[PDB]
Amino acid sequence: SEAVIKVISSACKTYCGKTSPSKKEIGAMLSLLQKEGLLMSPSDLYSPGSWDPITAALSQRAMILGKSGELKTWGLVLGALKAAREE
Numbered sequence: 001s002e003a004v005i006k007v008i009s010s011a012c013k014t015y016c017g018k019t020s021p022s023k024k025e026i027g028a029m030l031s032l033l034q035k036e037g038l039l040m041s042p043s044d045l046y047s048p049g050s051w052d053p054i055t056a057a058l059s060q061r062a063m064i065l066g067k068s069g070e071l072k073t074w075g076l077v078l079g080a081l082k083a084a085r086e087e
């Protein structure tokens, strides 16, 4: 939607620095996860136990369809969030 997007933005800008996903990339991945049935809300990313199925599903789609466009964004989020939850 909006609020959660900016939250993710400022978050990754602190963990990944300048090498963070652009807002235009964040929204794209967000909408994909919803239509894929992987997620249902923008706050779903706050669930660590739901990361595994997503990474698996995206990896499958990437290696089968031949495109890691959505996987790249996920990897960036996963890395930053994993580090955040590590503290």
Ligand SMILES: O=P(O)(O)O[C@H]1[C@H](O)[C@@H](OP(=O)(O)O)[C@H](O)[C@@H](OP(=O)(O)O)[C@H]1O
Pocket (backbone or CB within 6 Å): 006, 009, 010, 013, 022, 023, 024
């Ligand atoms: O303020 P930053 O540390 O430079 O991060 C920005 C902000 O999060 C911005 O939201 P806002 O315009 O509300 O500050 C967003 O739109 C940008 O993504 P993009 O470059 O594709 O336009 C992003 O880099």
